Amino acid sequence: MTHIDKIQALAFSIGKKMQTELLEQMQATGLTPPQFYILKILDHYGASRATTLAKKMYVKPSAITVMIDRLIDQELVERYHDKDDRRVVIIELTKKGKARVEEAMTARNEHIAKYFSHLELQEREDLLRLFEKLETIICGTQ
Amino acid sequence: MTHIDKIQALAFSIGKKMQTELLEQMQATGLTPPQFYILKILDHYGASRATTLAKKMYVKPSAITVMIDRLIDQELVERYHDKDDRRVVIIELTKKGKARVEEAMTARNEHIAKYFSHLELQEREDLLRLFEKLETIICGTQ
Amino acid sequence: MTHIDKIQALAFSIGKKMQTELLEQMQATGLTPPQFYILKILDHYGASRATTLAKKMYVKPSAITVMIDRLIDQELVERYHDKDDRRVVIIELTKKGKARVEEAMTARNEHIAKYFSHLELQEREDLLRLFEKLETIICGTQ
Amino acid sequence: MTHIDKIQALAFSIGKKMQTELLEQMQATGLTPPQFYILKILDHYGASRATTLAKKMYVKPSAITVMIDRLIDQELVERYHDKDDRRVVIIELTKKGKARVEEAMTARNEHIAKYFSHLELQEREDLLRLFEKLETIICGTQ
Ligand SMILES: CCCCCCCCCCCC(=O)O
Ligand SMILES: CCCCCCCCCCCC(=O)O
Ligand SMILES: CCCCCCCCCCCC(=O)O
Ligand SMILES: CCCCCCCCCCCC(=O)O
Ligand SMILES: c1ccc2cnccc2c1
Ligand SMILES: c1ccc2cnccc2c1
Ligand SMILES: c1ccc2cnccc2c1
Ligand SMILES: c1ccc2cnccc2c1
Ligand code: NI
Ligand code: NI
Ligand code: NI
Ligand code: NI
Numbered sequence: 001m002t003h004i005d006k007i008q009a010l011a012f013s014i015g016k017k018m019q020t021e022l023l024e025q026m027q028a029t030g031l032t033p034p035q036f037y038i039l040k041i042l043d044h045y046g047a048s049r050a051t052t053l054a055k056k057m058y059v060k061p062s063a064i065t066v067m068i069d070r071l072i073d074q075e076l077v078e079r080y081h082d083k084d085d086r087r088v089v090i091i092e093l094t095k096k097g098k099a100r101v102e103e104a105m106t107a108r109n110e111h112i113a114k115y116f117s118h119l120e121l122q123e124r125e126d127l128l129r130l131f132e133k134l135e136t137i138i139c140g141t142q
Numbered sequence: 143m144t145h146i147d148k149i150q151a152l153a154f155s156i157g158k159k160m161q162t163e164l165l166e167q168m169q170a171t172g173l174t175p176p177q178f179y180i181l182k183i184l185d186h187y188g189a190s191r192a193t194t195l196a197k198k199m200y201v202k203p204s205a206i207t208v209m210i211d212r213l214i215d216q217e218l219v220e221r222y223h224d225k226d227d228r229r230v231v232i233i234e235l236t237k238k239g240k241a242r243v244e245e246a247m248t249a250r251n252e253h254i255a256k257y258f259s260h261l262e263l264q265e266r267e268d269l270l271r272l273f274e275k276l277e278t279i280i281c282g283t284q
Numbered sequence: 285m286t287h288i289d290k291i292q293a294l295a296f297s298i299g300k301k302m303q304t305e306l307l308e309q310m311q312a313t314g315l316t317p318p319q320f321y322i323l324k325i326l327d328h329y330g331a332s333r334a335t336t337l338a339k340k341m342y343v344k345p346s347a348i349t350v351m352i353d354r355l356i357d358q359e360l361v362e363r364y365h366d367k368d369d370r371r372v373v374i375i376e377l378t379k380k381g382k383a384r385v386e387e388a389m390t391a392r393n394e395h396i397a398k399y400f401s402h403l404e405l406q407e408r409e410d411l412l413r414l415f416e417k418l419e420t421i422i423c424g425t426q
Numbered sequence: 427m428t429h430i431d432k433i434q435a436l437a438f439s440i441g442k443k444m445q446t447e448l449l450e451q452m453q454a455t456g457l458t459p460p461q462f463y464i465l466k467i468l469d470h471y472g473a474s475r476a477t478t479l480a481k482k483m484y485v486k487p488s489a490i491t492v493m494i495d496r497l498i499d500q501e502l503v504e505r506y507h508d509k510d511d512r513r514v515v516i517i518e519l520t521k522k523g524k525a526r527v528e529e530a531m532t533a534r535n536e537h538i539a540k541y542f543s544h545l546e547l548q549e550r551e552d553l554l555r556l557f558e559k560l561e562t563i564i565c566g567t568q
Contacts, residue, residue, distance in 0.1 A: 030456025172314025
């Protein structure tokens with residue numbers, strides 16, 4: 001219980017500001033932040049299992065399924081099943097998806113970059129691990 | 143730059159869930175999280191300077207002014223100027239405000255309490271200090 | 285299909301502005317717009333059946349149940365069952381609820397009042413009936 | 427004043443549902459509803475003045491400027507000045523923008539289409555003109 005009400009007070013105020021900036025980013029890139037991060041993973045590691053994407057995002061497989069369905073609508077990734085093992089679902093960046101992720105890189109919201117440049121690398125790592133833990137608690141993941 | 147896109151991906155997903163829970167809390171208590179925290183400060187320390195409230199919330203005086211104007215509309219606090227030093231602005235809980243903060247205590251969103259009970263006290267302290275730093279960066283405070 | 289994309293474009297832009305004003309109103313009154321309207325109904329007609337509230341709001345009984353649970357948390361209404369016919373659920377304004385609705389009256393967002401004062405009474409009636417129809421379509425009500 | 431609180435109650439409930447569906451649409455198409463409608467105008471009439479886009483959206487020129495800046499980030503339109511009259515600002519769909527608007531057509535949110543198919547064409551026209559009037563009142567346009 002301790003620190004909860006103060007954390008929520010700060011999260012509300014920060015979040016109210018961050019939401020405006022994220023709507024700008026969505027307007028400038030055509031992606032929500034989780035969609036963008038998905039594309040970055042696939043850009044980095046190439047074609048990957050949908051279950052690995054879920055693990056990297058700290059969400060359930062079923063949650064990644066919806067995300068991927070939306071990225072398919074935008075034609076940014078392709079989903080397929082391994083030819084012989086149809087249980088293995090592979091997600092892959094399309095040519096469009098690769099161009100979108102690079103464009104999104106350059107069109108990122110600059111106010112958000114400014115705020116986080118005032119946090120040490122080590123402080124960003126701390127926040128990220130706390131968020132990953134919170135996501136795990138919320139989603140019932142590992 | 144490192145960790146920024148992953149942090150935003152997680153913040154978006156967590157925030158989407160947290161927003162639903164905060165709307166419930168607003169419906170159940172009649173307060174946003176910063177308004178509730180303000181009332182808790184005034185319940186704890188009694189009548190306090192508006193500038194001290196601003197410091198405790200990591201926001202500018204001008205930001206606290208709007209918050210307090212809204213709490214005055216709900217009749218939960220009273221604002222007055224010291225009788226001889228009219229530069230000193232004091233904020234005080236009303237009888238209504240005291241009843242509201244106690245009621246809000248009991249009617250807090252239980253999903254949020256559940257999530258944060260899975261974080262160590264020390265992890266809550268870490269998140270809180272990171273949020274206070276982020277708020278300071280965003281608001282241009284000390 | 286015709287007019288749908290234009291309507292959504294306008295609804296998005298209007299809604300983005302209206303959301304800021306509604307958050308102010310929530311801060312100033314401690315009520316969301318449906319909670320406020322519920323209290324106005326109970327102020328006008330006195331104690332009423334929960335099913336009648338649902339009909340007046342164009343929502344399912346189950347939807348009004350959640351709303352009323354939240355108004356009970358804020359202690360603004362009381363729910364009870366008729367003494368002999370326990371199927372009849374009656375909702376009633378408390379002394380607190382009556383004071384809140386009057387206070388909310390005076391603390392209403394003035395920007396919203398300004399916009400709607402530029403619509404004829406007959407245009408407000410048209411919008412209201414279109415919204416009631418849309419609500420009925422969405423909620424599966426009568 | 428009459429009908430205002432009821433309209434806001436309904437707008438809040440409808441809007442809460444519509445927001446979820448619009449976030450899906452944004453995920454599925456990479457466009458907010460005003461961005462999509464802009465692209466539809468440019469698809470229909472070809473290259474058009476930025477001032478004409480503003481008129482068609484019932485917003486100020488300055489508002490369309492921001493929208494267009496975001497569509498430029500996504501590379502969906504091109505802005506240029508007439509070669510001899512540099513006061514005349516022309517907006518034009520790119521090859522990417524044309525493909526995006528067609529894709530967006532097919533990936534539109536089906537729940538929204540379902541709701542509006544239950545309104546007569548004449549009722550959609552009424553809502554649209556009321557929204558255009560409301561937008562005009564809010565933006566200070568003609
Ligand atoms: C009825 C549609 C609701 C529209 C939701 C728009 C979301 C706006 C987010 C607030 C940030 C801003 O106002 O820029
Ligand atoms: C046009 C009015 C817009 C209404 C904003 C309501 C905010 C809803 C927040 C989303 C959470 C939920 O759907 O429960
Ligand atoms: C993580 C918590 C999210 C906070 C949601 C706040 C809603 C803000 C609505 C946008 C209007 C405004 O910015 O004034
Ligand atoms: C801190 C970032 C805030 C994230 C805003 C996400 C908007 C969610 C809109 C509510 C609809 C839904 O929950 O599906
Ligand atoms: C609190 C609330 C929202 C956030 C959004 N992005 C990064 C950090 C955040 C902290
Ligand atoms: C990220 C986004 C929103 C939050 C809201 N409350 C607590 C923690 C959070 C982390
Ligand atoms: C469109 C979108 C949101 C609204 C909110 N309140 C009144 C009218 C509206 C029209
Ligand atoms: C009220 C609130 C939001 C809306 C969004 N889209 C269409 C109609 C609407 C009416
Ligand atoms: Ni296949
Ligand atoms: Ni005084
Ligand atoms: Ni009883
Ligand atoms: Ni040029």
